[PDB]
Amino acid sequence: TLNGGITDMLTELANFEKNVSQAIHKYNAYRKAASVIAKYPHKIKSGAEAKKLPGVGTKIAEKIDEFLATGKLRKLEKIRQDDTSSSINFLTRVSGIGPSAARKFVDEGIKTLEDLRKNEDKLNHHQRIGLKYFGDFEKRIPREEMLQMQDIVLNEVKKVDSEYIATVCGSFRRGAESSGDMDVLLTHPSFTSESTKQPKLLHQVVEQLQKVHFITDTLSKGETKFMGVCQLPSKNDEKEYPHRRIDIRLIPKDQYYCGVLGFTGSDIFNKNMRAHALEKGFTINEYTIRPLGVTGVAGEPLPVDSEKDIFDYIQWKYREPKDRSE
DNA sequence: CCGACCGCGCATCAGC
DNA sequence: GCTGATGCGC
DNA sequence: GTCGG
Ligand SMILES: Nc1nc2c(ncn2[C@@H]2O[C@H](COP(=O)(O)OP(=O)(O)OP(=O)(O)O)[C@@H](O)[C@H]2O)c(=O)[nH]1
Ligand SMILES: [Cl-]
Ligand SMILES: [Mn+2]
Ligand SMILES: [Mn+2]
Ligand SMILES: [Mn+2]
Ligand SMILES: [Mn+2]
Ligand SMILES: [Mn+2]
Ligand code: NA
Ligand code: NA
Ligand code: NA
């Protein structure tokens, strides 16, 4: 919170560039600046000071000066009063309505929550579910509920087959006291980088979590990635818990460490690490780290027996999950 | 200045 | 049906 | 929008 005013402004700018301008590198540039400012341990007193940080350049330095002086940014005040940008920014908050869809909907006169409900027939399945749970998906998840959810998932998985290992990653693994959603990494010894000896490995887990009325809806589902909705069960006479977003990802068991690194994040932390891995002659995905050739083509996967091994290849001192919240 | 910016699974669409 | 591009949410 | 080269 030391610089919460600045990082909020930059985040609002990033969202503007993503949703309205459809300018993805400006989006990430603003996100990058906001992340580096967010870990800087002094109350920023000027844009000159801010600009010393990697990722804060001249333009962001200017806007920091304006904000530090007036407590506002004219550019944002203008954006806020623009009805089209306003409507687009709102509509994108629905899961499945991206910048493209949102602009299309506004053009057709669909620009409020009321309009969206009136026109359910024009939403695809993902968007229909995002709208259905729009309000619930706004709420955060106390870690205590995350712990309850972990228990249901880990226990229900164990019931399908004792050799499933399910790990909760995401902000939960980084030690967050509240989470936007739940992210689950799934492995099973019959699914390795060398063979898939068992079919329906993910489907069986989804059906099981559905049978016990944990998973209530499905956003998308393939042979290795599920995205949907779940809900803790409520006690006798208790108000119902909010519906929550859940993702489950099945990974080859011999590639667990790149996977848990990849699904622990943060998203910015991954971008930073992967970018630095390129600079040191490697490419990292959620499956492998591979060396780059003189041309650029990736080599064969390098051996990995721990998260730290990946850090070692790229000349990075190890960082605990709790220190990867960028 | 200029070129690169992490890397991927699923849903949907256009084309053959 | 298959292949590739695009949107989307990560 | 920023930064290495
Ligand atoms: N490589 C990469 N990984 C991502 C990206 N976005 C999300 N992830 C991974 O997916 C994990 C879960 O994503 P989210 O649920 O949106 O993020 P989160 O850190 O869990 O935050 P909350 O759920 O809102 O508390 C992240 O921690 C990352 O490990 C991305 O843009 N690139
Ligand atoms: Cl851009
Ligand atoms: Mn999450
Ligand atoms: Mn998630
Ligand atoms: Mn039932
Ligand atoms: Mn609900
Ligand atoms: Mn580096
Ligand atoms: Na800088
Ligand atoms: Na959206
Ligand atoms: Na979220």
What is the tally of helical segments? 16
Q: What strand order characterises the main sheet?
A: 2-4-9-8-7
Task: Measure the end-to-end span.
Answer: 14 Å
Largest sheet: 5 strands, mixed
- Which bin fits the share of residues in helices? 40-55%
SS strand fraction: 5-15%
CATH superfamily of the largest domain: Beta Polymerase, domain 2
Bound molecules: guanosine-5'-triphosphate, chloride ion, manganese (II) ion, sodium ion
The count of β-strands is 11
CATH architecture grouping of the largest domain: 2-Layer Sandwich
CATH class of the largest domain: Alpha Beta
Order of helices and strands: HHHHHHHHHHEHEHEEEEHEEEHHEEH
Structural shape: globular
Number of domains: 4
CATH T-level fold name of the largest domain: Beta Polymerase, domain 2
Radius of gyration: 22 Å
Broad structural category: alpha+beta
Keywords: Acetylation, Cytoplasm, DNA damage, DNA repair, DNA replication, DNA synthesis, DNA-binding, DNA-directed DNA polymerase, Isopeptide bond, Lyase, Magnesium, Metal-binding, Methylation, Nucleotidyltransferase, Nucleus, Sodium, Transferase, Ubl conjugation
Region (DNA-binding): 174-183
Binding site for dTTP: 140, 171, 174, 180-181
Subcellular location: Nucleus; Cytoplasm
Characterization of this structure:
K(+) 1 binds at residues 51, 53, 56. Its main location: nucleus. Na(+) 1 binds at residues 51, 53, 56. This protein is of the alpha+beta class and 326 residues long. 48% of the residues lie in helices and 13% in strands. It has helices at residues 4-19, 24-39, 47-51, 58-70, 74-81, 83-91, 99-107, 113-118, 125-132, 134-138, 143-160, 170-173, 201-211, 256-264, 267-279, 307-313; strands spanning 141-142, 165-168, 178-179, 182-187, 191-192, 195-196, 215-221, 225-230, 244-250, 282-284, 289-291. The strands form 4 sheets. Strands 2-4-9-8-7 form a 5-stranded mixed sheet, sandwiched between helices. Strands 1-3 form a two-stranded antiparallel sheet. A hairpin with a 2-residue loop joins strand 5 and strand 6. The longest helix has 18 residues, at 143-160. The protein is globular. Residues 51, 53-54, 56-57 line the site of one sodium ion (NA). The structure holds 3 DNA strands.
